Design a protein around this ligand. Structure first.
Ligand SMILES: C[S@@+](CC[C@H](N)C(=O)[O-])C[C@H]1O[C@@H](n2cnc3c(N)ncnc32)[C@H](O)[C@@H]1O
Ligand SMILES: [Zn+2]
Ligand SMILES: [Zn+2]
Ligand SMILES: [Zn+2]
Length: 423
């Protein structure tokens, strides 16, 4: 029996609420995507199917765009790839926007696959589109995505008879905008995008009572606070390292609503997030656009070189509590780890630990994984009591946010065992 249920909220459309009391860590829903694809920067870096990175990937011989970690993944992916394959080939070397490839897989799944378990509570047809709130600028952008879709799908979709009944391409892209999920690997690197329509019932909170984590394309929804019967379930749609002004803009631009929560009313944590000299963090925030772009393409050496230029600058520096400085530190930590610079990684990672405690309150999967990385670096360095403390803290968080059903809990348990045997 389900612990959650769809309901009509008073002023946020449809939502999800608890049917039984919930405790921190309790698994509320599991889902595979209705449809998903690899994101632009991870294309050819991770496997199209399982979203794991490898040093060498096999490509699909027909289109040479889809790439896989194994013969098993390539064969298993063939049904959901067969029709897009003709489209990607005939449109080479033009590669579609991620949302267009995603919507292609939506159409093929809806036309050719059995009804999807991902739609059990809520279907793609049910999804909010926010049409009557879109600006003229947004509508124009969606009209270009429509034509991009029609161009890219020409080989497989000729007319409305190859679409689901009463299927409006404009309205479908509007649904995509405000219901796409960014998929991340175990290390919290962005690797894909997917639609999970039952999960799309969850409304936003800047201080949520639930959390989702991804294990490959599989999505786990867990409570991270006590929740009582009838209480609405919420997740945070946004990066925690954002000011209320930055949250207002993205929630307006992407989700067409204004947030009334306590954090937004009081600009909760804004002042701490923006400490240091404004001119300096303006420039660091500018640079982060290139840094994050490079990182989205796994270009670790260039990421590290840009981050070192900031972290160890000869010009003025920022406190580690500044969110842009914090972001640079994490990018440098993750680069060093992938480049095997483990002493330097531990240096940056340890510096993020107190800012992460402040900005990821309660149980948040992002902080749980960060602490696990630091303790793993400390274990490899022989700092056994210090590693053991952070590994236990990571377990305390990730037992709630990840849970037994997430394979990273297994990896963490082994690290805990290895570190305890040392002690
Ligand atoms: C993923 S859907 C959530 C389910 C949605 N309420 C529905 O009816 O299908 C995202 C949309 O829900 C609405 N929404 C989500 N969180 C909200 C909030 N905190 N306040 C008002 N509306 C919200 C916005 O319309 C947003 O674009
Ligand atoms: Zn694979
Ligand atoms: Zn192919
Ligand atoms: Zn808010």
């Amino acid at each position: 029996p389900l612990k959650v249920e769809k309901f009509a909220t008073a002023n946020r459309g449809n939502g999800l609420r608890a049917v039984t009391p919930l405790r921190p860590g309790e698994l509320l829903f599991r889902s595979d995507p209705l449809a998903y694809t690899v994101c632009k920067g991870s294309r050819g870096v991770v496997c199209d199917r399982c979203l794991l990175g490898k040093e060498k990937l096999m490509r699909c011989s027909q289109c040479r765009v889809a790439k896989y970690c194994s013969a098993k993944c390539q064969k298993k992916a063939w049904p959901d790839h067969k029709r897009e394959c003709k489209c990607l080939k005939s449109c080479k070397p033009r590669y579609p926007p991620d949302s267009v490839r995603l919507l292609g897989r939506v159409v093929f799944k809806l036309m050719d696959g059995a009804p999807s378990e991902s739609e059990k509570l809520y279907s793609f047809y049910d999804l909010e589109s926010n049409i009557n709130k879109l600006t003229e600028d947004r509508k124009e952008g969606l009209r270009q995505l429509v034509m991009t879709f029609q161009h890219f799908m020409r080989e497989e979709i000729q007319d409305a008879s190859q679409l689901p009944p009463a299927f409006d391409l404009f309205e479908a892209f509007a649904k995509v905008i405000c219901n796409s999920f960014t998929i991340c690997n175990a290390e919290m690197q962005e690797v894909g995008v997917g639609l999970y329509p039952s999960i799309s019932l969850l409304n936003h909170s800047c201080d949520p009572n639930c959390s989702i984590v991804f294990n490959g394309p599989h999505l786990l929804l867990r409570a991270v606070r006590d929740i009582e019967v009838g209480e609405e379930l919420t997740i945070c749609y946004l990066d925690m390292l954002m000011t209320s002004e930055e949250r207002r803009k993205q929630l307006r631009d992407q989700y067409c609503f204004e947030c009334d929560c306590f954090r937004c009313q009081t600009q909760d944590k804004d002042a701490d997030m923006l400490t240091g000299d404004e001119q300096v963090w303006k420039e660091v925030q500018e640079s982060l656009k290139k840094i994050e772009e490079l990182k989205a393409h796994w270009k670790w050496e260039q990421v590290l070189a840009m981050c070192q230029a900031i972290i160890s600058s000869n010009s003025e520096r920022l406190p580690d509590i500044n969110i842009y400085q914090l972001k640079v530190l994490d990018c440098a930590m993750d680069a060093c780890i992938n480049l095997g610079l483990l002493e330097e990684a531990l240096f940056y990672g340890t510096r993020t630990m107190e800012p992460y405690r402040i900005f990821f309150p309660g149980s948040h999967p992002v902080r749980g994984v960060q602490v696990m990385k630091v303790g793993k670096l400390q274990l490899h360095q022989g700092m056994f009591p210090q590693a053991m403390k952070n590994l236990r803290l990571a377990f305390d968080i990730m037992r709630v946010t990840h849970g037994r059903e997430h394979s990273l809990i297994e990896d963490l348990i082994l690290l805990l065992e290895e570190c305890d045997a040392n002690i």
